[PDB]
Design goal:
The PDB classes it as hydrolase/hydrolase inhibitor. The structure is a homodimer. The first copy, chain A, is mainly β. Chain A has one domain: Beta Barrel (Cathepsin D, subunit A, domain 1). Chain A contains 1 helix and 9 strands; from the N terminus they run E-E-E-E-E-E-E-E-H-E. In chain A, a hairpin with a 2-residue loop joins strand 5 and strand 6. At the A-B interface, strand 1, strand 5, strand 6 and strand 9 of A face strand 1, strand 5, strand 6 and strand 9 of B. The complex binds ligand YDP (2 copies). One ligand YDP sits at the interface of chains A and B.
């Protein structure tokens, strides 16, 4: 689709067998999801941005279907305010900005 | 332009007579800039996101030229890690997401 930005660019995703909503976030290098159950090995990690930092769990090679487009990659799991799809996955579904 | 997301979507902006770089950020409702000198009245404000919150100064009706496109609107000023152009201004320059 083409998505205007008068509202937050929220899409449905499927990850770890679960349905969620997430924000297409061009300002995020990485993909960060609220606490959730994901199978497998992970690594403790600290990420920052405005306001300070959070501890995350880093899970690699995770399959995620974003608005119907499949991608595989790294997903951080932790106390984010909202689920964020960052550029590491936006590139995989061919998302661009246009103006 | 069309902008892919293999790199951060950084554009040049002109605001308050100064040249800066800023990130086109679809995940941001608002526009937040590192400390800088802006003329006029402002209001103290607290914004949050991953990690906690920051105190900002809220300046309204500010003219900003983003990658050559003019817009006027609210700009928050404070301890953000990077200059962010949020949806309040992305809508004004006709920016969309496409995939
Ligand atoms: C967790 C993460 C990757 C992004 C979360 N953030 C909002 C992006 N929308 S942010 O304001 O903390 C932030 C934004 C941009 C940067 C940067 N280095 O350019 C660093 C941090
Ligand atoms: C300051 C601001 C507007 C955004 C900075 N952030 C990165 C966006 N890139 S964030 O991770 O703190 C954040 C992202 C999304 C939301 C939300 N409510 O959807 C709230 C906060």
């Amino acid at each position: 689709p083409q998505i205007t930005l008068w509202q937050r660019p929220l899409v449905t995703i499927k990850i770890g067998g679960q349905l969620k909503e997430a924000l297409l976030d061009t300002g995020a290098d990485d993909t960060v999801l609220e606490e959730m159950s994901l199978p497998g090995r992970w690594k403790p990690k600290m990420i920052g941005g405005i306001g300070g930092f959070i501890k995350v769990r880093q899970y690699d090679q995770i399959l995620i279907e974003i608005c119907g487009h499949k991608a595989i990659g790294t997903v951080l799991v932790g106390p984010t305010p909202v689920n964020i799809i960052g550029r590491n996955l936006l590139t995989q579904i061919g998302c661009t900005l246009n103006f």
